[PDB]
């Protein structure tokens, strides 16, 4: 087994429809899985997206699953770009977007055939639920757009305050605050943060983060070389995640250093405060266990997920694996252990949170919770 955590199922029996989805799928297929946190799970599955509510009663008088039909796109269609949307079935709203914009929204879960449909050179990374009902649709160039649902059954949509995208602009990922409304984007070279209300944005700032932290990760991870000072001008530093907890932003790094031999990968969790609308002079890098070679640069993928806003505990994840890691000082931390999904043909499909758990959605175990021993 694992040594420090229990690893099942989370929740009952899945839905007769992800059972099939599952079970039929191949190891060519790509599933993804959209986890949200009102406690709804998005399987986009070929031309269909599975909406379920995760049940964590068996009752079946509880129990709810529709299936949704997709606008058509030449491209496979992704889990990070759906996004269920609740007032306070009928509670659930939905809105998909494809890699070119073209967008179909669903006021209710309850009326399948019900939706609406716009559109926005442009690749679209993800799509997120925000504050009054409305969406953010965010491009690989971090061109952000708010869409806007009318009763009338059309989409309002406008470009975020100096957010027309695209120094490179690059778009690693987004995360919405809900209880500050705040959004913030990660590019290659900063963060950006918006404050937001039902119907518009106010710029806060932008973070030359690569400026600020990148002494404090070479430092972290080569500065004890001797010879650090001709070594970190070749560093290669990625940011590839961000996510926030009580201490504040936490920020996944990758960072290398081509002629190191052997050329490993560090991955680092960065935490800073996100205080005003300037970062202050404490920053804290974490070096993680998980420190592969360096393969390729396309081939640096990694993700990851904060259940647990107040433990100083990250699970970084790749498709098969997870690292639970520790943040801060770590003296809240649980132990660091590598969870291994790549088993006979099992594979980490999603991850996310339910009321603080760690969830994985697994290919070969469906939603499965990573909970300490003790």
């Known amino acids: 087994e694992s040594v420090n955590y229990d690893v099942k199922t989370f929740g009952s029996s899945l839905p007769v429809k992800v059972m099939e989805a599952l079970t039929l799928a191949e190891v060519d297929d790509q599933l993804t899985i959209n986890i949200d946190e009102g406690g709804w799970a998005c399987l986009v599955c070929k031309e269909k997206l599975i909406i379920w509510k995760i049940a964590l009663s068996p009752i079946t008088k509880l129990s709810v699953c529709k299936e949704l039909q997709l606008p058509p796109s030449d491209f496979h269609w992704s889990a990070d770009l759906v996004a269920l949307s609740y007032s306070s079935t009928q509670a659930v709203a939905v809105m ?44 690989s160039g971090s061109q952000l757009i708010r869409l806007i649902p009318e009763s009338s059954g059309k989409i ?11 120094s490179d602009l690059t778009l690693s990922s987004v995360l919405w605050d809900r209880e500050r409304s705040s ?14 209300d039902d119907s518009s944005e106010k710029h806060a700032y932008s973070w030359d983060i690569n400026r600020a932290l990148k002494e404090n990760i070479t430092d972290a991870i080569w500065g004890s070389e001797s010879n650090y000072e001709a070594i970190k001008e070749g560093v290669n530093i990625r940011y590839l995640d961000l996510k926030q907890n009580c201490d504040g932003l936490v920020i996944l790094a990758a960072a290398w250093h081509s002629a190191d031999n052997p050329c490993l990968i560090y991955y680092s969790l960065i935490t800073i405060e996100d205080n005003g609308c300037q970062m202050s ?21 990694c993700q990851l997920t904060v259940p647990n806003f107040s433990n100083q505990t990250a699970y970084l994840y790749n498709e098969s694996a997870v690292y639970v890691c520790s943040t801060g000082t770590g003296k809240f931390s649980l132990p660091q252990e590598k ?36």
């Open 156 to 166: 309002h949509q406008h470009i975020l305050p100096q957010g027309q995208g695209m």
């Open 339 to 374: 969870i291994v999904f790549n088993a006979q043909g099992d594979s980490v499909l999603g991850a996310g949170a339910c009321g603080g758990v760690p969830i994985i959605f697994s290919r070969n175990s469906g939603l499965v919770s990573i909970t300490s021993r003790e």
């Open 183 to 196: 959004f913030y984007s990660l590019t290659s070279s900063n963060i950006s943060k918006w404050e937001l």
């Open 96 to 139: 998909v977007a494809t890699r070119e914009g073209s967008i179909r929204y669903w006021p209710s879960l309850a009326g399948e055939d019900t939706y609406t449909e716009a559109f926005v050179d442009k690749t679209y990374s993800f799509l997120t639920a925000v504050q009054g009902g409305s969406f953010i649709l965010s491009s």
């Open 281 to 301: 002079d404490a920053v804290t890098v974490e070096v993680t266990q998980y420190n592969p070679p360096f393969q390729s640069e396309d081939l640096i993928l």
